Structures are given as C-alpha cells and as structure tokens.
C-alpha cells in the first residue's frame, strides 16, 4: 500500500441514465485489493427504482484498477493515477438490446470515484431483461490491445436465463489514462479473466451487493513461433 | 488409440468458394493428437492462386476434433463419430469484411474428412486483407455454451497487421452432430483456449503450412456462489 493504489482501496459510485426510454439513478461503495484482482460493491437504486428490466445489465458498467497483474504485463490503469482515466463502450445484445456507457474514473481524497453515464435501447419487451428473468452472468475472457494512443477491450459476455438457457451480448470498449502518452509504459496484446458474481439482492433489486476478480495474463498455450 | 477417434490421426481437407468474388479452391492433409489438442496441417492453392486476399483469413476454416479436454467437460465432436458433426460460422471484420463458412466433418477409412464451403464479401480493396499486408493471428478464446440442441461458439480475434497493429473480427459458430440428441452427454457452459499459428508459406502463399493448439477447459478464477 506504499504507493497511490493502496494494497486496499475503497471505491464511489455514481450511474444514471435510462434503458427504453426509462430514467433511473444508482449510487454505491466498496472497497477491495486492486493488487489481488478482487472486488465488492453495494449499490443501490436512489431513483426510478424498481428499475423495469434487469439489473445483470448494468453490471459490467459498475472498476479497471481492481485487476491482478503478472510479469510482462503493464498496468494501463494503475500507472494513471493521480489523474485517472476514462471509458466508453456500446453493448450489443443479439435479441435486440444495445448499451451505452461513459464512464469517469478519478481519485479524490484517496478514495476511487466512478461516475457513469449510460444509455440502454431496444431491449425486447418480451425479453428476458425487460422481464427481469436474467440469472447472473458466466465467466468470460476480455481481449485487449493498444490501439489509438489507448487501450482496446473486446467482450463476449453469456447471461443466464430463467428456464435454463443463455443471452449472448458483447461489446467493445476504450480506455483511455489522462496521463502523457510518452509518460506510462503501455501494455501490448493480453488477456483479461473476469468473474462477475451477485452477492445479495433485495427490495425488488433496489439494492445489489455484488463481486468481481480479474485477473491480467497471457495465453497460457506454448507458441510454435516463440510468440507470448 | 483403442477407438475410433485413435491417439493420432490423419485429416483430409477440401475448400472451395469465393472472396470478393475471386474464386479459389484449396485441398489439404494433416494429422495431429486428437486428445492433446494438437494439429497441423499442409495446404495448397489448387485454384484461383495466387489468392488476391491474405490466407489468414482463412485460417480458422481448415477442425474440432483435435481438442483437448479435462474431467467435466464432455466432448461434442469426439462423441460424434463414426457419423461426423458440422458447424456454420459467420466471421464480420470491424473494417467491413464477412466471411460465412459452412463445413461438413466425417470420418472415411479411419482419416477425417472435411469439406467446407466459403463465402467472403465486402473486404475493403485498401484493407489489410486484400492489399494481404496481414501477420498471423493471435490466439484466443472460445466461449460456448448448449443452444437449440447443437454447440454454440462465439469468438472473438485480432489480426496482426503490417505496421504494428490489429485487425478484429469476431463469429459465432453453430455445432451440430449427426448423432441422436439422447445419445452423448452434451457438455456445459465453457471455454476453448486456442493458438492457431503458420509455420511455414511460399509460392506467393499458394502453400501453406499452419498449426493449432485448442484446450477445453472452465474459467480458472475461483466462483463465491460456488459456480464452475
């Protein structure tokens, strides 16, 4: 914890935004160890809630310091601060759906802060999220790689279903340090591991406790061409 | 090697169709451990070579049997045979391309059999691809997961480009055995590690050799809710 990235840091959130044209606000707070890859956070619905689709959908838009790093692989997110960083991305469902986010990541007093604008459209009205028949997300394997002075994530995402079945969704996202670019040491082409779990949910999800670990890596199959 | 998929086995391999309207046709033989998930193959232009698009592009078209699979995961295509399994795929490239493939796998006097039928279209005339300014893949994962009685995969890729950077492109892929859907054990939810990688090419690239290293296998980061 010698450092600005605390061995343990703890985390603000503020979202709002709308998804089919339904406005809604939601703020929260956690705390883990960016140095383990590990995450808790407990949100709640301060507005427009009970939120008319599922929360599972904004889960992935609630903290990029918080990934386990190894050997050769530099840390995009930890090597901005004190400034922070920023990122956007769009969200594809393949029933329709499509979100939005814009998100802020700065630190002030110590403590993370995360401000989120989103934007969700076109999510079936019969389907599982306006249903709100979503059961947590699957695993899932993020691809990154420098690409216009920022870093470049691609996702694949599964989202369970009621009945036993699975929703496909994936999404692109940037990063971009407000740092110099001549200033940290960029990454190249890695992998990011993610599990993103629901701890608690109550009041109609109105309130949502849930868990991330993610961790940095490459490949773990040998290269024929000597390659990482 | 007690069965019908052996410790080591031979492939044979038959592709033909078009790419921005060029016709080619490609012919191939290979063999590799089907349980180590190893492979490697030759293949040769027969037709339409020199290619006027890069050979890349074509890469994850020319084979599922060679997988290698731990305790948990049960094996779509090895359960398979003697009948054989197919799988159509659509690949979309960010700078406009789309490859859709269509391939049949059958297993004829002990060696693999494969027949593809490939259509690609809209690849940029100034795009890496076509001006075949293109350096190898790097590996990925595959996502997949039970759907309407067959496999579904979803991948997600970058090209490596003249220069330094990335070409993406992701697909989603549809597995179906020949075989009775009360007969194998259909696998779960889970992930395919993969590193495809070229070996060696001449001629103007109208021979190629590539090779393959694929590991079915769950997310590695331990689950809260006790979830694989």
Not at 121 to 149: C, I
């Amino acid at each position: 914890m010698n450092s600005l990235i605390k061995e343990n840091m703890r985390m603000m959130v503020v979202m709002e935004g709308s998804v089919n044209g339904y406005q809604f606000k939601c703020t929260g707070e956690g705390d883990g160890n960016p140095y383990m890859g590990t995450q808790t956070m407990r949100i709640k619905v301060v507005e427009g809630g009970p939120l008319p689709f599922a929360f599972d959908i904004l889960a992935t838009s609630f903290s990029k310091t918080f990934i386990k790093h190894t050997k050769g692989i530099p840390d995009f997110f930890k090597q901005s601060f004190p400034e922070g960083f920023t990122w956007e991305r769009v969200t594809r469902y393949e029933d329709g759906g499509v979100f939005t986010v814009m998100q802020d990541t700065s630190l002030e007093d110590g403590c993370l802060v995360y401000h989120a604008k989103v934007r969700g459209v076109n999510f079936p009205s019969n389907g599982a999220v306006m249903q709100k028949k979503t059961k947590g997300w699957e695993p899932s394997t993020e691809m990154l790689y420098p690409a216009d002075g920022g870093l470049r994530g691609y996702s694949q995402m599964a989202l369970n279903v009621d009945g036993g079945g699975y929703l496909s969704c994936s999404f692109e996202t940037t990063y971009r340090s407000k740092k110099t670019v001549e200033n940290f040491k960029m990454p190249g082409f890695h992998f990011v591991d993610h599990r993103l779990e629901r701890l608690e949910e109550s009041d109609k999800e109105m309130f949502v406790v849930q868990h991330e670990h993610a961790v940095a890596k490459f490949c773990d199959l040998p290269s024929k061409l000597g390659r990482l």
